[PDB]
Amino acid sequence: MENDKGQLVELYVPRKCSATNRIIKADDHASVQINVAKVDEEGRAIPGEYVTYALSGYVRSRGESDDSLNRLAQNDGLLKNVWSYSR
Amino acid sequence: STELTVQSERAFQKQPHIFNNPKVKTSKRTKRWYKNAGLGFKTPKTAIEGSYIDKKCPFTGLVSIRGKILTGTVVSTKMHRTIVIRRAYLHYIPKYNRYEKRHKNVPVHVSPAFRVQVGDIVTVGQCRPISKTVRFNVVKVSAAAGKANKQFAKF
Amino acid sequence: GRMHSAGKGISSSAIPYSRNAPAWFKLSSESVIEQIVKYARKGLTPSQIGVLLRDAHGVTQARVITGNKIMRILKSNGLAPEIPEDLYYLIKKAVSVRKHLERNRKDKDAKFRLILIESRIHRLARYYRTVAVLPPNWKYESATASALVN
Amino acid sequence: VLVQDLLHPTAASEARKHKLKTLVQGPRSYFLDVKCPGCLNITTVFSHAQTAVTCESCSTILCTPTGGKAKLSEGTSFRRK
Amino acid sequence: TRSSVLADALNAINNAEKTGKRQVLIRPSSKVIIKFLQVMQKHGYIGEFEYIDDHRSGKIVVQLNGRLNKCGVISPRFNVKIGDIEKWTANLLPARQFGYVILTTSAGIMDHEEARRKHVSGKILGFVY
Amino acid sequence: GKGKPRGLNSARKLRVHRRNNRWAENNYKKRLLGTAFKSSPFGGSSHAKGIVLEKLGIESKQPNSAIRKCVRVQLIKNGKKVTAFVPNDGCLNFVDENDEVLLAGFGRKGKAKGDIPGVRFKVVKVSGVSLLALWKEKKEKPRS
RNA sequence: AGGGGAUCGAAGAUGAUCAGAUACCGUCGUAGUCUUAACCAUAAACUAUGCCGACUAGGGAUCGGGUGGUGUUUUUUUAAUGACCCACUCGGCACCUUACGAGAAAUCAAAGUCUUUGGGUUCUGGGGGGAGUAUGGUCGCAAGGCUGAAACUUAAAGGAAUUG
RNA sequence: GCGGUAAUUCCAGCUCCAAUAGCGUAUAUUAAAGUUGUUGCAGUUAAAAAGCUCGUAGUUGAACUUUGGGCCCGGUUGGCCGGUCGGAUUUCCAACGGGGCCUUUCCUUCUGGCUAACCUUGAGUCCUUGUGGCUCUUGGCGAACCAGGACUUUUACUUUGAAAAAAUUAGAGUGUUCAAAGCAGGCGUAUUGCUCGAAUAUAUUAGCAUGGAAUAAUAGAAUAGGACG
RNA sequence: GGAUAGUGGCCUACCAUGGUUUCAACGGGUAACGGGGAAUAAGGGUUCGAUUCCGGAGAGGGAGCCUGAGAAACGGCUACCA
Ligand SMILES: [Mg+2]
Ligand SMILES: [Mg+2]
Ligand SMILES: [Mg+2]
Ligand SMILES: [Mg+2]
Ligand SMILES: [Mg+2]
Ligand SMILES: [Mg+2]
Ligand SMILES: [Mg+2]
Ligand SMILES: [Mg+2]
Ligand SMILES: [Mg+2]
Ligand SMILES: [Mg+2]
Ligand SMILES: [Mg+2]
Ligand SMILES: [Mg+2]
Ligand SMILES: [Mg+2]
Ligand SMILES: [Mg+2]
Ligand SMILES: [Mg+2]
Ligand SMILES: [Mg+2]
Ligand SMILES: [Mg+2]
Ligand SMILES: [Mg+2]
Ligand SMILES: [Mg+2]
Ligand SMILES: [Mg+2]
Ligand SMILES: [Mg+2]
Ligand SMILES: [Mg+2]
Ligand SMILES: [Mg+2]
Ligand SMILES: [Mg+2]
Ligand SMILES: [Mg+2]
Ligand SMILES: [Mg+2]
Ligand SMILES: [Mg+2]
Ligand SMILES: [Mg+2]
Ligand SMILES: [Mg+2]
Ligand SMILES: [Mg+2]
Ligand SMILES: [Mg+2]
Ligand SMILES: [Mg+2]
Ligand SMILES: [Mg+2]
Ligand SMILES: [Mg+2]
Ligand SMILES: [Mg+2]
Ligand SMILES: [Mg+2]
Ligand SMILES: [Mg+2]
Ligand SMILES: [Mg+2]
Ligand SMILES: [Mg+2]
Ligand SMILES: [Zn+2]
């Protein structure tokens, strides 16, 4: 959200649901920020290093929190099968 | 409208100053006068061919066409030698930013050269006041009928 | 829809993508077009023919094998009825309903049913009349209507 | 739900759906080469007769009409083409 | 009976954007619907749509993304007059700086701004944001 | 769409349907029926001069109690006869019968003022002077 | 206007009750109640909720139709049947739970997809009282139906919910 | 809503507020009013869905027909440079529009008048090793519109333009001392004159003129009474 | 055909049966001259225009006419009414 000459005006470029890309806002004390763990060679799980996803309060409310997560973490590589594009 | 007779009046019908000297033996009997009214309307040969008199014929009469050229669907053919078209049109009501159907019934004189039936689209031309109401004249028939000879009987 | 009730019955033919074919169908255009007219003359409505040819014969849809609706096949063979068959089957009904009401003035429900039917009739004709298949003046009439079907 | 392939639905969920409410709607009746061994030459029948089909030569019978599919009479075989 | 095939297509889209979805199946397609769905993706308010060819009138499948708040249609396709196009955008677009009234002109179905550079006019179809 | 036809060509319906429902518009009707010119004591005018018949003492409406001193007036232009209030303390001694008062409204569009029942007019001047003036004492009532 | 007139029973007459008691309770019982021929056209004629089309969400029942099964039961010799079971699918009458949503709320899968305000269309309402009154027209044998004002008056009337 | 004996509402005194050469009051209308609702209401219970269904006028009404690709011409903003003594244009770049082509493709149509344009070419060349460039007659462009014949399915919408009164409105110029105004005025050799002005826009529903060919109608070849010849 | 400056049911004679209408004819109301405009300022609107410019009608109500290029004139006439 620029300005006349360059200059990033207006505070706060808010988050964004990964499922729906609708805006995660402030009084949305209902949404979520899942951090999955970046593992390495044999079980060990590299702390402080994540793959993350943010889901709107709305999606979680409509119950779609699980299924949509599945698809997200799988076509991001941390699920093999489970999910299916067809139905 | 006319048809038949031609000389069916108390008065003798004839074109003004279109003399035929009987002394001079002829094969057409009556010399006839016609004109091309202009503006791109063929003067149908049934004006030239014909025998009707009609002093209000735009092709064989003393009326002249000028001013508005209008078109309308023929809606009534019940008066001798003059019909009444209905020109319709949508009218804009600006508070509502929408239109409504209105119409007018312009009465117009029609020359024997044309045969018109009800429904035909016509093209009229303005002329001098010809009667109490008619200020236009049939100048071209656009349609024909309504595919009438293809509404007939059984196989 | 359901133009004279609160019926909402989705119910139809689900007709092939295969706008030609069927390949397992031998025969010929000759064959059916002939076969069509045999029943035409034997006195059948294009509907009954389409139905008979669909079961006994392998005529999936008579157009797909002769690019021609049956009523067109019939018309072009001078075997086409006075008035359209749906208008006919309509009128026919309104008659038999009427003959019921003659014998039973006491049946207001028939009255009601009759109205509905004729109002379908009346509106149908207006179509057929508009599109030139019935003379610009054709009318249905209780008086004459019964003689009109038989 | 929330995201799926409307374009490539499964062979089984496209299966159970109504005949009009499928992806491209099509028929689901079939056709039959029907035999009653009294004959040699078999006749082609539509799965939902209406017209109780009679055989080629003999006025035998064949099938009888119902609500939907026809009931084929007694000792008969068939095929779907 | 079914009376503005376009207006239905926009509603479906809107209701799947609301319900948080990412694909709509729309019926029965139309030239216009495409040339509307075209402007939408041309300013990237939906993803890609596919025409499936029932031998009937059509089906489209819009994959969309959620950048869209509201596509909408103007039900009596009023006549707009070169200067009143500002007035339309005014009444129904969220801000001066984005989103288009898409409308119908003799020179193509086009967002109001393209309809400015080309300097044509015609009827009003729908809008997007 | 509930109600209104949305058609592009349905203007006639829409304008006429208006014309109609305007009649439930209270003052639109009054204005077209010419209620002003017809009923109502004043001609439609802002004021009217008339003449005093009797001095009256109207008891106030609840929950108020008093006696609200008025004049029955027979309007000149009109013949029509009207009761009207004589405002402020005293004033009713300025009036006397058969005098010529100028009436005016009460600013309620008809509709009697307050705890006064059915009086819709007030006095502004007697014998040509202004009631106000006389009250204060900037002026004195004329001859007879 | 006939026929019918068992039953219950507007009116009327009584017995009781009551300060009274033209009533409520009990008795008697006319018209009516039923039917034919013709009227009348009104009901809180109610879901107090227009019709057509689309879209948006979960669940178990059920009514009618149909598809599917090395289902159960009927036994005969297996079948055929018929009823029953389970999966589905249209289309019914509904109920359940939610509420993305809607509402002033009560509540509502429509009363939702509306200031992010436009699918098509019909009708009605515009403070309360005056008053469904006067009037005219029209329909009716009548009773009455439809259409249907104003003067004047008046600061509330009303709705849903909360606490008492 | 105050007043029935301590009146924050009356009658006054004091003090105070608002507007001020003006301020009150009556009546009307307009805004507030999304309480007339096209934009923009409401109708379960607040006012309000006809007992029901048919149905003419009226309003409304599914999808489908030249789409996609290639080439040419020259515009108007904008950038990176300025060549130049504030603004200039060529090469470079995008980006936004307009015109005309070839893709099986009426462009109404023949009969010359006419040509502005290249498939031309007749020479060669100012000059960057040349398709960078235009003057230039002798085979080969139609449409740019003349004018005469022969003919044209109907609309709606939309663009642009003519024709148009002034005052009024919006608005430029100008120091009526300001201003409401007005259309004046401004410069000198103020001794024999110099000179800027008296804009612009709106102007619509209809009519006319013209560019468009999406959206929405209308007409056509089915008893062939078809179409070109 | 007459009449007019002239078109025209303008009038007459003869002849026909037409013209308008839910897209509101016809009738009623108007405390109605029409327009340029005026008031209210989100827009869409609502209301208003007797009244400085244009057009129109009148000159107590009606009719009739002279003069003249031009009047159905009224600071012209003639009649009836008031
Ligand atoms: Mg006649
Ligand atoms: Mg219906
Ligand atoms: Mg349906
Ligand atoms: Mg069926
Ligand atoms: Mg009312
Ligand atoms: Mg008295
Ligand atoms: Mg008087
Ligand atoms: Mg009895
Ligand atoms: Mg009693
Ligand atoms: Mg007693
Ligand atoms: Mg009694
Ligand atoms: Mg009722
Ligand atoms: Mg009930
Ligand atoms: Mg459900
Ligand atoms: Mg079974
Ligand atoms: Mg009170
Ligand atoms: Mg004291
Ligand atoms: Mg005191
Ligand atoms: Mg004081
Ligand atoms: Mg003030
Ligand atoms: Mg609008
Ligand atoms: Mg309201
Ligand atoms: Mg109510
Ligand atoms: Mg109802
Ligand atoms: Mg009715
Ligand atoms: Mg369409
Ligand atoms: Mg213009
Ligand atoms: Mg000017
Ligand atoms: Mg007659
Ligand atoms: Mg009316
Ligand atoms: Mg007047
Ligand atoms: Mg005026
Ligand atoms: Mg006026
Ligand atoms: Mg006046
Ligand atoms: Mg004039
Ligand atoms: Mg005069
Ligand atoms: Mg008189
Ligand atoms: Mg005079
Ligand atoms: Mg004079
Ligand atoms: Zn057999």
From Swiss-Prot, chain B:
Localization per Swiss-Prot or TrEMBL: Cytoplasm
Cross-link Glycyl lysine isopeptide (Lys-Gly) (interchain with G-Cter in ubiquitin), sequence positions: K14, K45, K55, K56, K78, K95, K104, K132, K140, K147
InterPro entries: NA-bd_OB-fold (IPR012340), Ribosomal_uS17 (IPR000266), Ribosomal_uS17_arc/euk (IPR028333), Ribosomal_uS17_CS (IPR019979), Ribosomal_uS17_N (IPR032440)
Keywords (A to Z) from UniProt: Acetylation, Cytoplasm, Isopeptide bond, Ribonucleoprotein, Ribosomal protein, RNA-binding, rRNA-binding, Ubl conjugation
UniProt-listed PROSITE patterns: RIBOSOMAL_S17
Gene Ontology BP terms: maturation of SSU-rRNA from tricistronic rRNA transcript (SSU-rRNA, 5.8S rRNA, LSU-rRNA); ribosomal small subunit assembly; translation
Molecular functions (GO terms): rRNA binding; structural constituent of ribosome
Cross-referenced Gene3D superfamilies: 2.40.50.1000
Sequence positions bearing N-acetylserine: S1
Modification comment: N-terminally acetylated by acetyltransferase NatA.
GO CC terms of this entry: 90S preribosome; cytosol; cytosolic small ribosomal subunit
Transmembrane segments: none
Main location as per UniProt: cytoplasm
Family: Belongs to the universal ribosomal protein uS17 family.
Quaternary assembly: Component of the small ribosomal subunit (SSU). Mature yeast ribosomes consist of a small (40S) and a large (60S) subunit. The 40S small subunit contains 1 molecule of ribosomal RNA (18S rRNA) and 33 different proteins (encoded by 57 genes). The large 60S subunit contains 3 rRNA molecules (25S, 5.8S and 5S rRNA) and 46 different proteins (encoded by 81 genes).
Additional facts recorded: There are 2 genes for uS17 in yeast.
PANTHER family given in the database record: 40S RIBOSOMAL PROTEIN S11 FAMILY MEMBER, 40S RIBOSOMAL PROTEIN S11-RELATED
NCBIfam families: PRK08572.1, uS17_arch
Official protein name in the record: Small ribosomal subunit protein uS17A
Curated annotation (Swiss-Prot), chain C:
UniProt KW keywords: Cytoplasm, Isopeptide bond, Phosphoprotein, Ribonucleoprotein, Ribosomal protein, Ubl conjugation
Cellular-component GO terms for this entry: 90S preribosome; cytoplasm; cytosol; cytosolic small ribosomal subunit; nucleolus
Alphabetized InterPro entries for the sequence: Ribosomal_uS15, Ribosomal_uS15_arc_euk, Ribosomal_uS15_N, uS15_NS1_RNA-bd_sf
Subcellular location per the Swiss-Prot or TrEMBL entry: Cytoplasm
UniProt crosslink position (Glycyl lysine isopeptide (Lys-Gly) (interchain with G-Cter in ubiquitin)): K38, K42
Keyword Nucleus set for record: no
UniProt-listed SMART domains: Ribosomal_S13_N (SM01386), Ribosomal_S15 (SM01387)
Assembly with partners or alone: Component of the small ribosomal subunit (SSU). Mature yeast ribosomes consist of a small (40S) and a large (60S) subunit. The 40S small subunit contains 1 molecule of ribosomal RNA (18S rRNA) and 33 different proteins (encoded by 57 genes). The large 60S subunit contains 3 rRNA molecules (25S, 5.8S and 5S rRNA) and 46 different proteins (encoded by 81 genes).
Name of the protein in its database record: Small ribosomal subunit protein uS15
Entry keyword Ribosomal protein: yes
Biological process, per Gene Ontology: cytoplasmic translation; maturation of SSU-rRNA from tricistronic rRNA transcript (SSU-rRNA, 5.8S rRNA, LSU-rRNA)
Record-stated family: Belongs to the universal ribosomal protein uS15 family.
Molecular function per GO: small ribosomal subunit rRNA binding; structural constituent of ribosome
PANTHER family: RIBOSOMAL PROTEIN S15P/S13E, SMALL RIBOSOMAL SUBUNIT PROTEIN US15
Curated annotation (Swiss-Prot), chain D:
Positions of post-translational S-methylcysteine modification: C39
C4-type zinc finger locations on the chain: 36-58
Keywords: Cytoplasm, Metal-binding, Methylation, Ribonucleoprotein, Ribosomal protein, Zinc, Zinc-finger
Cofactor(s) this protein requires: Zn(2+)
UniProt remark on cofactor binding: Binds 1 zinc ion per subunit.
Record-level Gene Ontology MF annotations: RNA binding; structural constituent of ribosome; zinc ion binding
Superkingdom of the source species: Eukaryota
Reported modifications of this chain: The N-terminus is not modified.
First-listed, main subcellular location of the protein, grouped into a coarse class: cytoplasm
GO biological process terms held by the UniProt record: maturation of SSU-rRNA from tricistronic rRNA transcript (SSU-rRNA, 5.8S rRNA, LSU-rRNA); ribosomal small subunit assembly; translation
Xref: InterPro entries: Ribosomal_eS27, Ribosomal_eS27_Zn-bd_dom_sf, Ribosomal_zn-bd
Location of the protein in the cell: Cytoplasm
One GO cellular component, as annotated: cytoplasm
Family: Belongs to the eukaryotic ribosomal protein eS27 family.
Other remarks on this protein: Present with 43300 molecules/cell in log phase SD medium. There are 2 genes for eS27 in yeast.
Subunit structure comment from the entry: Component of the small ribosomal subunit (SSU). Mature yeast ribosomes consist of a small (40S) and a large (60S) subunit. The 40S small subunit contains 1 molecule of ribosomal RNA (18S rRNA) and 33 different proteins (encoded by 57 genes). The large 60S subunit contains 3 rRNA molecules (25S, 5.8S and 5S rRNA) and 46 different proteins (encoded by 81 genes).
Name recorded for this polypeptide: Small ribosomal subunit protein eS27A
Upper lineage: Eukaryota, Fungi, Dikarya, Ascomycota, Saccharomycotina
The gene coding this protein: RPS27A
From Swiss-Prot, chain F:
Protein name per Swiss-Prot or TrEMBL: Small ribosomal subunit protein uS12A
Gene expressing this chain: RPS23A
Glycyl lysine isopeptide (Lys-Gly) (interchain with G-Cter in ubiquitin) cross-link, renumbered residues: K55
Entries under InterPro entries matching the protein: NA-bd_OB-fold, Ribosomal_uS12, Ribosomal_uS12_euk/arc
Additional information: Present with 10600 molecules/cell in log phase SD medium. There are 2 genes for uS12 in yeast.
Matches recorded under SUPFAM superfamilies: Nucleic acid-binding proteins (SSF50249)
Cellular localization per UniProt: Cytoplasm
Predominant place of localization: cytoplasm
Family: Belongs to the universal ribosomal protein uS12 family.
GO biological process, one term: regulation of translational fidelity
Signal peptide: none
Domain of life: Eukaryota
Molecular function terms from GO: structural constituent of ribosome
Cellular component terms (Gene Ontology): cytosol; cytosolic small ribosomal subunit; ribosome
Xref: PROSITE patterns: RIBOSOMAL_S12
Species of the source: Saccharomyces cerevisiae (strain ATCC 204508 / S288c)
Record's function text: Component of the ribosome, a large ribonucleoprotein complex responsible for the synthesis of proteins in the cell. The small ribosomal subunit (SSU) binds messenger RNAs (mRNAs) and translates the encoded message by selecting cognate aminoacyl-transfer RNA (tRNA) molecules. The large subunit (LSU) contains the ribosomal catalytic site termed the peptidyl transferase center (PTC), which catalyzes the formation of peptide bonds, thereby polymerizing the amino acids delivered by tRNAs into a polypeptide chain.
Modified residues (3,4-dihydroxyproline): P63
Keywords, sorted A to Z: Cytoplasm, Hydroxylation, Isopeptide bond, Ribonucleoprotein, Ribosomal protein, Ubl conjugation
Pfam families the UniProt entry points to: Ribosom_S12_S23
